[PDB]
Each structure stands twice: as structure tokens, then as C-alpha cells.
């Protein structure tokens, strides 16, 4: 790849939505899900990513019309419950 001074800026926001796939910042690779790529790979929460590219408004991880863009209104960065209730 290259990840020697320069990594894969995924150009400036406001269209890093595209065609149902978000691009990644930093890599360059697109998907539906950030969030999860973002903790796997680059780790840490989708917030506190987004202060290293400065990204305004928050700007959503998750695919453009996921839950209302706006983590279905409520319930912060991280996890409800660590446990998977109900089937």
C-alpha cells in the first residue's frame, strides 16, 4: 500500500457519502459500517476519530441513511449493553 508520511486521505468531507458506501479517512477503502473498521483497524470510537481529521458536525461512520444519520437519536458512541439480548 504505502503508510510512509501521507496514509490515504479519502478527500475532504461533505462527500465522503457516497452510493450507500462511506469512504474511509485515513485508508482509503470504502463500506457501509466505519464504526466497526474504524475499531478494528484504526481502533478507537468513532467520536474521538473523528477530532484527528477535524470532521465537522461529527460526521457518521455508518452508512448515510443508517438510523436517521444521527445514531438513531440518542444513545452515545460505544455500547448499550454487552450482552446480546433477545434473539
Same mark, same amino acid.
Given at each position: 500500500?504505502?503508510?510512509?508520511?501521507?496514509?490515504? %486521505?479519502? $478527500?475532504? $468531507? /461533505?462527500?465522503?457519502?457516497? @452510493? @450507500?458506501?462511506?469512504?474511509? !479517512?485515513?485508508?482509503?477503502? +470504502?463500506?457501509?459500517? !466505519?464504526? /466497526?473498521? !474504524?475499531?478494528?483497524?484504526?481502533?478507537?470510537? %468513532?467520536?474521538?476519530?473523528?477530532?484527528?481529521? &477535524? #470532521?465537522? $458536525? &461529527?460526521?457518521?461512520? $455508518?452508512?448515510?441513511?443508517?438510523?436517521?444519520? *444521527? +445514531?438513531?437519536?440518542?444513545?452515545?458512541?460505544? #455500547?448499550?449493553? *454487552? *450482552?446480546?439480548?433477545? *434473539?
Amino acid at each position: 500500500a504505502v503508510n510512509v508520511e501521507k496514509q490515504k %486521505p479519502a $478527500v475532504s $468531507v /461533505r462527500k465522503s457519502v457516497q @452510493d @450507500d458506501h462511506i469512504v474511509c !479517512l485515513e485508508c482509503g477503502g +470504502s463500506f457501509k459500517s !466505519l464504526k /466497526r473498521h !474504524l475499531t478494528t483497524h484504526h481502533s478507537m470510537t %468513532p467520536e474521538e476519530y473523528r477530532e484527528k481529521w &477535524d #470532521l465537522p $458536525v &461529527d460526521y457518521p461512520m $455508518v452508512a448515510p441513511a443508517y438510523a436517521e444519520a *444521527r +445514531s438513531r437519536l440518542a444513545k452515545e458512541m460505544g #455500547l448499550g449493553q *454487552r *450482552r446480546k439480548a433477545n *434473539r
